[PDB]
Amino acid sequence: DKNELVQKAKLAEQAERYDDMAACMKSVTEQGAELSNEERNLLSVAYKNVVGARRSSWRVVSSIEQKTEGAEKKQQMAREYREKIETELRDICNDVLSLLEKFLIPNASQAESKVFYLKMKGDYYRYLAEVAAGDDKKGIVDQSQQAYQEAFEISKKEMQPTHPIRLGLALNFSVFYYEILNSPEKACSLAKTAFDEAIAELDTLSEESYKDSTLIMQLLRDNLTLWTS
């Protein structure tokens, strides 16, 4: 039953057992119906933590690989372990991207949901690009960019500048430009515009989310300050 799976997923989250949490929300999604806002968050939170652990481990091992130049045994061990981590990471994001293509994006009836899932598609293709091989990379990068761009156009047409999903998309899209495309000027332009447009419209704030929109705005400016150094 769906509500049993959602109820167990909440249990897994409280236990910080995010593989369990993701398995339950994957099963819910595969039932084919549009996800509730509560179910959507639980799915997003579950896989964010599942992929985040691999991304963090990857950063550690890849940095070790780079500081063991001239240490043949150590470098080859780190390289093989990084590739082991990468395989786990790719399977996770392919599972998410499959759920997005087959259920989440086609079932999204509202503009807010479309922006959310298209941004999620951009996110998990970005994670694939972080670890992609030479000849696969450009195609993966273009897939992330196209998902972000479509979400970006819908968000600018249907949401107010202070909407946290619109702001969160601008945050991650700017991060994509800085970290994946190595285009700091476009990254800072995108982030600065999103911040300024939200400042111009502070009247479009709800009690439920005004806290979340100002937190993202601070993150936007923090990145702006870091990238300007």
């Binding site: 950063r59 996110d123 969160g168 945050l171 991060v175 800085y178 970290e179 993202i216 993150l219 990145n223």
Partner: peptide, 9 residues
Amino acid sequence: RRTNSDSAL
């Protein structure tokens, strides 16, 4: 890495 994405929330 000091750059932050939405995951920081």
